């Protein structure tokens, strides 16, 4: 087998909004992970269930590449056992997570002059998400007793709101691109190897 196509995930031109995060399982390939965990051009590199230097002597069945864009303040929430509007309503990691979280500042790519309104997040949900669930629905959230009948109004809000990503934003408010690698093993033979 030849390279795992991790480049086309890290180096994609368009990243997804956190509410509608993208995924791509990797299979039947080999990859050197030092090229990432020694990059230093990633502002964030945290692995939870595994040594990043042990990936080379470890094989797995699948590797999942979840990518999205959140706010700099919220990179804290992309971790096991975290709360907040991102970890509750947009992207949730299991407590028994085995993988690595990789993030970097994209203010120079995703911040626009009058604000970039393409990047959205979910501000309202009735139930907190389950691990690795994705809700892309646009249902008018009921914030009261009076139903909404599919119409936005009083206590009837559109559940998605936008990061107004501007290049003059504070660093905690700047856009950060995220790639979440999830290493999985089951009875299916391991095909993706370090």
């Amino acid at each position: 087998k030849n390279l795992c196509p991790f480049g086309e995930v890290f180096n994609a031109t368009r990243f997804a909004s956190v509410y509608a995060w993208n995924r791509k399982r990797i299979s039947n390939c080999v990859y050197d992970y030092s090229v990432l965990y020694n990059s230093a051009s990633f502002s964030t590199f945290k692995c939870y269930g595994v040594s990043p230097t042990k990936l080379k002597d470890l094989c797995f069945t699948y590797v999942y590449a979840d990518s999205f864009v959140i706010r700099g303040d919220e990179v804290r929430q992309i971790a096991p056992g975290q709360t907040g509007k991102i970890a509750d309503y947009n992207y949730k990691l299991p407590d028994d997570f085995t993988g690595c979280v990789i993030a970097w500042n994209s203010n120079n790519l995703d911040s626009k002059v009058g604000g970039n309104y393409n990047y959205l997040y979910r501000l309202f949900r009735k139930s907190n998400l389950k691990p690795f669930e994705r809700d892309t629905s646009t249902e008018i959230y009921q914030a009261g007793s009076t139903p909404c009948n599919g119409v936005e109004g009083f206590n009837c809000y559109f559940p998605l709101q936008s990061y107004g990503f501007q290049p003059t934003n504070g660093v905690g408010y700047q856009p950060y691109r995220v790639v979440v690698l999830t290493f999985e093993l089951l009875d299916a033979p391991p095909t993706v190897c370090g």
Partner: antibody
Amino acid sequence: QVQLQESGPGLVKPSETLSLTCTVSGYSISSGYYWGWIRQPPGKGLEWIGSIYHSGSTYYNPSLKTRVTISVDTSKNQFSLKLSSVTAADTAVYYCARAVVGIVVVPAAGRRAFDIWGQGTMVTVSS
Amino acid sequence: QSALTQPPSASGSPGQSVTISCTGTSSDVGGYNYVSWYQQHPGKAPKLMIYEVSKRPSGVPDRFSGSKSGNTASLTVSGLQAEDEADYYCSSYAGSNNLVFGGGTKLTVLG
């Protein structure tokens, strides 16, 4: 400092295609918002023609969908209006405008309220 | 004629309160809370005064207010000033018909 400016011929021979272009400055159309065209015949009311955002999706006035095309040129930051088979009833002041809402996926997006307007160019349909 | 009824003319006095009505159907003004109000002075572009039924853009004086009741929406202008004499249009989303406009109301200050 979002600004919109209309350009195009002030005269169009009947049954031929009207063509207008709206140049946007101070804000990239790719960044967000819906961009629409509204016309007004002399001494009459406002008629919304259609709206568009940077992907190319469009919503049109039902009384004009067979003759209206709205395009967008993001690399050159403008969006255009083509209206074919014109008559005297198409003689109007044509405005280009920007929607109030920057989010593109809101309900009725591009068919709600319009926030910044151009000064409006007038097209006369005559031989 | 137009998709939304709007009285052709409304006559208020200086400093008083004038209200313009806009009557649609259940498929437009009754159906949704996306009613917009525009001011147009002779020879200049329309100006947004009220959006989303009651919201007011910045700079618009708080003299101008909008509300909705059933299939009828209304814009109210209190403290009528001299430069309030203009044309006024209501707007609404109508589902299949998308954005539809009222015919417009002429407002003249009686002084």
